[PDB]
Design a binder for this molecule. Structure first.
Ligand code: HEM
Ligand SMILES: CNC(=O)c1ccc2cc([C@]3(O)CCn4cncc43)ccc2c1
Length: 466
């Protein structure tokens, strides 16, 4: 009695559990590196920090490519921009100009700290009007970080009530929802097997965004001046101007898509982490209580928190590190691709192979972390609690190497200042219905959290002062 002819085999059920965890569970059986074949395409999944650092750092240039996806093609206007552009001249030029722009907010009066605090001050006055009510703080935080990035990109911002903010929120939501069903990593190409309108829907959302950025870029052409380089669009037009004396790599479509990536990444990524951090503080009142004490003893109510306070609010800094470990923004980074024949752990990897770094596995490795599934900001502090520490080398929240995060300085300062200002001024508690946020998460292009509500109250201590 023979065995059945076998035309296909997958190690776990598709659409059953979170992809990054399914891969991690497989390492028990198959090791920290294995492959899956899907037609002509082979994908390698790497789940150990030493192999990850080889792909990202040591052989970074070998695996600095991106795989081309029909979905990502539409969002990136055919692989323009930064995040979804393949390695090469385009990507390297626009990545440098983006990083170069964040230099113009180092110091001065538009010091990045000052643009951020300006928008947090509006956020906090906004939220204070909801004293005693339970609310979803998604949109208020979205507005604040949208204005930070609009100032970095255009030196402009939106006033309260501007309907355009809602238009952006709408198509941000629609693109993320249709960009991928779950993670960017899909084992089966359902998009090409059964009839569906995913690409149609994604196209219409991308049309609205492209139309909106065009209007901004068009009306700004007449305001641009060579001697005034104060934001990202200036940096890009200066390069286009000093090029027509590589100008094909600076067409209007190239400038638009790159600013779209910064606009998108700068908003959806920071809003999500704030929401996650809040959710964890609701499940961990003990940690929340010690944070209030920490900020009352090191900043008080004489002033508002500053970036310099990052040397004094250590537990707050440790909390942000722990959220970025436990619920990484990108559990599997963005997929990589081998530009040439190379190797990982001395295993052959052919050119064109898609390579995926399971950051979730790195952050939950039980040999590298103590009780990895527990929210313990303590793990990033010495036993005394007097200085931050790096307990593990298997920790890469922002990736590393050629394709690493370029908005890391912005994210860290936004996250620290938002939480510092909120904790100084507000009690943040379970809403009166008693529901706690679900910490399971929703894997999309970003690791999102289910929407939830918080009862916001102006702290008595903050009130008694002033
Ligand atoms: C908590 C916040 C953030 C985290 C944890 C984070 C993390 C990451 C990770 C893991 C990657 C992929 C690394 C790889 O593919 O190897 C990435 C890429 C990227 N991030 Fe973020 N990021 C954050 C915030 C931001 C912000 C605020 C911006 C922009 C304003 C930004 C812009 C980008 C871009 C453009 C890329 C693509 C880089 C490239 O492909 O060359 N990120 N980030
Ligand atoms: C209407 N357009 C959008 O909503 C939009 C566009 C591009 C995005 C890119 C990113 C990244 O670059 C890709 C993942 N990730 C982690 N950190 C930075 C990034 C994240 C969200 C985006 C949203």
């Amino acid at each position: 009695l023979l065995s059945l002819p076998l035309v296909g085999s997958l190690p776990f059920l598709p659409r059953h559990g979170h992809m990054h965890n399914n891969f991690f569970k497989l390492q028990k059986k198959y090791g920290p590196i294995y492959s899956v074949r899907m037609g002509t395409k082979t994908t390698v999944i790497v789940g150990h920090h030493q192999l990850a650092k080889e792909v990202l750092i040591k052989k970074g240039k070998d695996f600095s490519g991106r795989p081309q996806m029909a979905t990502l093609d539409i969002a990136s206007n055919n692989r323009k921009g930064i995040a979804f552009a393949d390695s090469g001249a385009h990507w390297q030029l626009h990545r440098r100009l983006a990083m170069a722009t964040f230099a113009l907010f180092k110091d001065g009066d538009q010091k990045l700290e000052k643009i951020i605090c300006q928008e947090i001050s509006t956020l906090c006055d906004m939220l204070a009007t909801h004293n005693g009510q339970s609310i979803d703080i998604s949109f208020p935080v979205f507005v604040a970080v949208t204005n930070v990035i609009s100032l970095i990109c255009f030196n402009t911002s939106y006033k309260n009530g501007d309907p355009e903010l809602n238009v952006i929120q709408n198509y941000n939501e629609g693109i993320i929802d249709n960009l991928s069903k779950d993670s960017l990593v899909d084992l089966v190409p359902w998009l090409k097997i059964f009839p569906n309108k995913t690409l149609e829907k994604l196209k219409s959302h991308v049309k609205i965004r492209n139309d909106l950025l065009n209007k901004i870029l068009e009306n700004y052409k007449e305001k641009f001046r060579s001697d005034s380089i104060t934001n990202m669009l200036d940096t890009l037009m200066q390069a286009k101007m000093n090029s027509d004396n590589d100008s094909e790599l600076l067409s209007d479509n190239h400038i638009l898509t790159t600013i779209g990536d910064i606009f998108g990444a700068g908003v959806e990524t920071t809003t999500s982490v704030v929401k996650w951090t809040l959710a964890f503080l609701l499940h961990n009142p003990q940690v929340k209580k010690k944070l209030y004490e920490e900020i009352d003893q090191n900043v008080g109510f004489s002033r508002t928190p500053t970036i310099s306070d990052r040397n004094r609010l250590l537990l707050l800094e440790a909390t942000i590190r722990e959220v970025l470990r436990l619920r990484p923004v990108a559990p599997m980074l963005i997929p990589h691709k081998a530009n040439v024949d190379s190797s990982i752990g001395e295993f052959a990897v052919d050119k064109g192979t898609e390579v995926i770094i399971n950051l979730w596995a790195l952050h939950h490795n039980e040999k590298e972390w103590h009780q990895p599934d527990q929210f313990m900001p303590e793990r990033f502090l010495n036993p005394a609690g007097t200085q931050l520490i790096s307990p593990s080398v298997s920790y890469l929240p922002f990736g590393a190497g050629p394709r690493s995060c370029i908005g890391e300085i912005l994210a860290r300062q936004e996250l620290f200042l938002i939480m510092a200002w909120l904790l100084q001024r507000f009690d943040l508690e379970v809403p009166d219905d008693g529901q706690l946020p679900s910490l399971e998460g929703i894997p999309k292009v970003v690791f999102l959290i289910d929407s939830f509500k918080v009862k916001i109250k102006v702290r008595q201590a903050w009130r008694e002062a002033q």
